[PDB]
Amino acid sequence: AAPVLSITNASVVYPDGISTVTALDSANVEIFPGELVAIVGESGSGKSTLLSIAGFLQEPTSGTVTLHGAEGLDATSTRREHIGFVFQQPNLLGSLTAREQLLITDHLRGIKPRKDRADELLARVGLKGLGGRRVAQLSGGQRQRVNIARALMGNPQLLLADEPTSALDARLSKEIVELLRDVTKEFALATLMVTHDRSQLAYADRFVEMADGKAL
Amino acid sequence: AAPVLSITNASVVYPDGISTVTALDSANVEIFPGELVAIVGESGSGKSTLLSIAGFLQEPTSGTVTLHGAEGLDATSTRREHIGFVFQQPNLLGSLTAREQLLITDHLRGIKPRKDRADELLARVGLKGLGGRRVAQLSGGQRQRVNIARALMGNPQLLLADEPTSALDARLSKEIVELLRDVTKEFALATLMVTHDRSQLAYADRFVEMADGKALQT
């Protein structure tokens, strides 16, 4: 009965080289707890720009973005306490082990790292017992799975997935979406998922299509 | 009726962490001069592995890959003399200017870099009088445009393009595939073009659909 994210009439203008370019154009999106919302469109239509706005990775050049429950907080503090990121690249920190890639979020948040929680979440992603693996002992899918688990470590209310099936085959990409939706449902997460594989809309509750920076 | 590139039953298996992974499984592709051969299929289907294979960047774990006119060369001598790479990211060297992005290929081939050709090519790609620009002053479409031009400096026989419209809106991505098609035809290049944007097949003479590292073919 209360939305988590609201992007009202937002636009982004990057300085593209010597000139400027309108990346996002009057974007309007609102996600509620337990929703899986896809954002479809070709590469360069403004999908990533909208995602990065939804994660406070850059303020819109015009229009407002409100994450309710984090009102009155700077952009960085907003990401740390309310948003989990599932980057397009697993972005596992080389020198850390599977379990340590959850724990460092606890540390950057200023709390005694919770080992048991990390093992449960790794098991919740089907890596049970693999807490000790290093990045070299993780397959393509497994790293993406460790990535998801890390997004879940701070128990956010906004889960942002940036084409997290881009380097995985047909089988593995199904699993990540099934996992993403299943977790979205179990923990009442509001999730944006950018995707170009329209075969994955079937697992999203809804979707936005985007073209030339305007959402439809 | 004589291919520039012949990929015959080519397979690639990388070590995916503890286990292995058949990234490409018995792919059979052939490209003739004047063709823009598109390769479509989702992200993770094996397009890029087939590309890398085609670009003598890595040998297949099984099956053979041939570029005619260049037989009897190591992997790297083949790329330097008969292939042009339009990488997915522009891959411009930061400290060089636009024209220097092309001239540096001429230097790595052992020939005194020819500024005329470097400018002629920059014009053909529609960047006339921008050879003085540095990367910081080049937009997305322009960097990609320098990339194409750099691929043409060596007068290649095989022009490989890895999703060169990945970060471009619909207007600009048309211009780039038009430029690729037009340069392909005008220089009788054999061009493989990996692409996820199904709207660009129109510009291709043929297309191969791919799924899980296997080329679909009737």
Added chain:
Amino acid sequence: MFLGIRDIRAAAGRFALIASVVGLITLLIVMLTGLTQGLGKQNTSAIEALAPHSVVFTTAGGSSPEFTSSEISEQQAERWKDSTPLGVSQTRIESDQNANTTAVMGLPEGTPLPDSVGGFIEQGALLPAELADFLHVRAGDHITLGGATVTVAGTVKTENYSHTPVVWVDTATWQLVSHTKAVGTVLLLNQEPTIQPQDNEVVTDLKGAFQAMPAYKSERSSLLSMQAFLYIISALVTVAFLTVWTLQRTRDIAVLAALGASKRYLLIDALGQAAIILAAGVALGAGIGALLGWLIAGSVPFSLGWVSVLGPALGIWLLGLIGATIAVRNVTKVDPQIALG
């Protein structure tokens, strides 16, 4: 500080190379520090031990005073009340068994010697214990001191003047050995001077009394400048390495920034890693340094204390921290959009 420490664990190689460089520079600085303090005590230990307040010299042509050219006449000594004349010369000492050159300091008979030296000025010559052993001489044996036969009054400890040990003699004996009508070469004043000095006289502090020694200032100055370059080189090496190195981490730092890591967090992480690395290097350098210095302190003059190994050690490490913050400044400027690439 979480990621920073485990980067060091998983890549001990890269840091071993750089920490070795910091360790060598600290090793050189610690040993150079020990050597300059040793040479300084090699030139000043006797005068410093005597601890005068001011020191009155004699000059020629109004030039700067020099211990090699100053003499105090008897009248000059009566002028300065409550003060005694100290004669300083270097000459040859010859025993029946051996010979060498040594410094001779002469003071009025009965003047108590510094606890560094102990005893009191006696009639005749008091030899340093090591010098008497070298010459196979015992207290009471005759020795040739500057061409004059003198009686060994006893053995003493060693203080130094111009890289030579000091033989202590009564003012009368010093006159015979240095062939001078003067009562000394300078006048030691332990109280503050209450008389104004004459045209040919010049008052100096204990420090300034050292610069009147020929070798001392011109060689301590050169050694100190070398130390200054060494400290500067250490700071620049750390800054150079750490600027390039922190640039290497932009990607992992960007991921943490995107995740929500504060600027303080990233800056603390980066500086913490540098502090550990610099600590390792400096500790090993000063460790190896004190060991090598103690190992060498018999053949070469080398003063080895806690302040002379850890003073420079802590100085270098703190220079490294200032340098490190300079190199790490850019960890807070990393745009988090670098993580979405």
Added chain:
Amino acid sequence: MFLGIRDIRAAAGRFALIASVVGLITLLIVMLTGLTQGLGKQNTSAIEALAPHSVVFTTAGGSSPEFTSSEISEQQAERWKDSTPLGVSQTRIESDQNANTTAVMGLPEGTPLPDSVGGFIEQGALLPAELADFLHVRAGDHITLGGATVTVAGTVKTENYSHTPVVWVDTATWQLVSHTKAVGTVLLLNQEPTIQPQDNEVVTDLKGAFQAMPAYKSERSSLLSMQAFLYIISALVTVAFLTVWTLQRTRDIAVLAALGASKRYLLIDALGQAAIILAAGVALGAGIGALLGWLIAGSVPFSLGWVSVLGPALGIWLLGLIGATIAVRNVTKVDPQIALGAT
């Protein structure tokens, strides 16, 4: 070599920092080199001028010979034929207007001095010109040397012994100033030693004769050891910095690799950049080095030639090139697949 040189032009900042470190280390090394050679002649310039072939000492308790403890008795001198007595002492010199301490060397009367010093041994004392200027003493004035009044026989050039200038006197006068019946402290031999020495005698070559000087070995050795640490520190700094630096270019090197650049091309590119950086740093450091030394060589002992500045300079540069190849070894081990995707 194309990319390497233009990386320098467009990003001169980072390279200036590291080039300064190389320049400072060379600056320190260049002046330490000149300073160590300057002190050696400050300790040895006079004896070198006399240029003896072998040198006979006198010892006690079979210890190492010492210039502070050797004397040759007159009979001992007749044993060794074809020998010249050298008396070496340091004592106080006092003029009517000034005084100071200096070294006095004594040789037999009438022996011509080496062209390095020239003139002949005369009855009396031959003074260095600069000391006479300091003392306000002219030809014909009486001076007190170690408690003995002798007339200034003339001026000569300056040689040094134990950081003091050498005053040249006849063997008889030196005995008066040094208060000894010996005919000298050592014997200079221009010929082959053909007499056999006694248990208490010891013959040495010119180099080993400097060991008998008190300050020389223990101070030149310490300076040489410092220079060695400095060369090692230079090599390690370059290796340390260049390994991390080449790891920065992996992406650009991968792109050139992807385009087809041979391994020699990338490695020649990389070392060219390093060699240029090292050349600039060493030249700038050594330039400032030679300047400060020539500027300082009047107040502090500093020997300055071409070999004592460029020898060390060239040595550092070659150490750096060897170091750089150790650091750039991984430029040829980069797979070009890095360019196909993102880093």
